[PDB]
Design a protein around this ligand. Sequence first.
Ligand code: NA
Ligand code: NA
Lengths: 419, 419
Amino acid sequence: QLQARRLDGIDYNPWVEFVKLASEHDVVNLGQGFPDFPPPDFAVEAFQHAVSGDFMLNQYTKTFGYPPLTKILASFFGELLGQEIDPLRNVLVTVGGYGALFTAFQALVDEGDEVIIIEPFFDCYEPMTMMAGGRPVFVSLKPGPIQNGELGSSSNWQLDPMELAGKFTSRTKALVLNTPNNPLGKVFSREELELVASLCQQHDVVCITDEVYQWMVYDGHQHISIASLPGMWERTLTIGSAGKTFSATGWKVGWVLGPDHIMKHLRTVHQNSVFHCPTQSQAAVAESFEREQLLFRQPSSYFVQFPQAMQRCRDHMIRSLQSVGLKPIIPQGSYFLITDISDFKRKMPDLPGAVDEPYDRRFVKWMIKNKGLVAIPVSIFYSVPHQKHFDHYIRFCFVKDEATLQAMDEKLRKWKVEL
Amino acid sequence: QLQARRLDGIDYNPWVEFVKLASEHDVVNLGQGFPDFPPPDFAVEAFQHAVSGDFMLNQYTKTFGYPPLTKILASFFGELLGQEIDPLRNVLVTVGGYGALFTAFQALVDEGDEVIIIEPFFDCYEPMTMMAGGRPVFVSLKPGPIQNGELGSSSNWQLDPMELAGKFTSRTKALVLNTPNNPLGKVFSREELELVASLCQQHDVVCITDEVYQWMVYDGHQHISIASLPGMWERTLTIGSAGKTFSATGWKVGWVLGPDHIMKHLRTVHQNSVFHCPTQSQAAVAESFEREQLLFRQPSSYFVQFPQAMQRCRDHMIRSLQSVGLKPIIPQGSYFLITDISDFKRKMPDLPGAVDEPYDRRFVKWMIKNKGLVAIPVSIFYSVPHQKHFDHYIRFCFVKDEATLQAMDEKLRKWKVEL
Ligand code: NA
Ligand code: NA
């Protein structure tokens, strides 16, 4: 056998199919989880400055991060977390949030360790756990009671304390928390975070917290970082993404924040994998954060203006999608919302697909080809045994240009005529 | 323990210490393996174009590579290798040559596998083998016996056919070939590559070939790619680095080329680690290769001009270092040359240092503090059992500005005439 056993069961990449199909039809692409408009001017200018400035920025920088970037991350997130952060010992710059996650799993997860993952989960958590020899253990958010004709809210998908507690064992190494959650758009409450924190402390478990959508919060909901809770800094790794912060997903710069006794192991993985991150994008991200720190909580800041603008896009999409009978679940954060397609499953059950194929995957293919709209089937964010049960949601991304939302409405109006 | 056992024995990073000591003294830094002058204008301009062009270049590109980049890599290297290369199946863009190496080890090396490593080796090959559960197996190039009438050549460092053959077993998974070699600067001959090819075919072993210094060849010596030899494409992974190609080490873009039946496993690692490489640097690299393809073999091409310029730098450094009794080994390629310090070990045997600290490490510290010149001790490129024997070489980098070479000569003047 040529390949390593660590690759068992993790070769299938659903994203390649999704991207391929969308490219082959006339569509409004609401499946792409990135903006189709420019990043803010200050961010693009920052990168332009980095590639036209000091010529030595074309050469290697320091292994654990470009010092101006680790300095501003430590200062800014130190303030946000109520934590003294040492840029040398508590910050690691990585190749995006993906690279940060990978670094954490490869540092901490070992053969036989259990890792608690919360469904619906960003799909890589499962195969990253597996490649590190871990055993994924799933806890499932419970969709709230659908009442009195109103739309569901992500806030009401519950993390049951008894279910969660039952998942912790002596083999648990880590719990992966993603808030705001992709795909659901749930913003975890202080009470929910206190529940997770209490169990992590009880069982001596590390919390890997993926906070890439930190700034994308709506309706007055506040992002709370679990590392800011009492006793949690010493057992938490906090992950962010410049791409999701500054609407520049192609920059692929991320970071991990955490205490030295954990971070030293991530540094070991880093120096034995990529060694350096690119210099100039790090300089761009540092300049961008400096801009936002100076304007923090002011009306002209991107972190104030941008979520307000995207909240309007969310509301537009929520209203529009109902015109064809899709039932949105209102998100409190992230780039995304999901819609229940149960009415379609009930009335239109017989879509072509493979024998075991979840309805949502079949429905998305039908929607792309026939209605000209792309979404992502939510079953990809579930463990395989649960996919047959959570097969009736699809994920839309509303972080789109005005023109794209208008184009969406053109497709929806056509669909409504033939309902 | 908290951390995964895959990290055992790979946490010590010599480079962090090297940077530290140099930063504390007034030095000419010939330890840094990167240019201290700008990349060529066309390369810097290409990056400027990528960050000021199509705004959608700020967002994600395709998982396995920015298509214009994979297209030109497949075209350009397909012609050099005498191989039809499909961009989608045979090319993977990675986070530098480092990331490419890491991806290869994680795809192919498993618990118990052996990996043959040729000393002196780029230092990461050993811990990357270890982190993947492999057992490193070392074969040493044997230094040419030198007559002090004329300087040794890296070409005289021999790969003994019997010694190499004896390293192969049923457990050998891969052999790592680095040519041109860092730190020695050896450019492997056709005969040497035919020896490696014969054994890899006989034993059904994969050759991981690190060709980052491909363009840095001197004195009429030709880079030969082992994947071009009969029957080798089907068992070789060929690695390159944009940083080493365009003198832009901080760009951190690299690639692997190989047959689909091996590459599919590298894609599995990639999609479960970083998922995307940054978009804009990939675009810059593609444009830079387009420029060099158009000017292939022409006087104005970087691949013609740059190695000629650096050969002059090499010759300057070879002459200069002899003034103080260092004995250079003339390299045929790479950024580097090594000097034998055996005369210093003879005359000055008792340098301060830790227990069992190899002489070369002690000598470099002495030279930094007293003479203001940085080199890298070559013992870091040897397995621990062999460091006792190979303790009398240090590595210099001659890919430096003319002002830096002038500053080197000032230090050498002081060394000779002062104190
Ligand atoms: Na425990
Ligand atoms: Na064999």
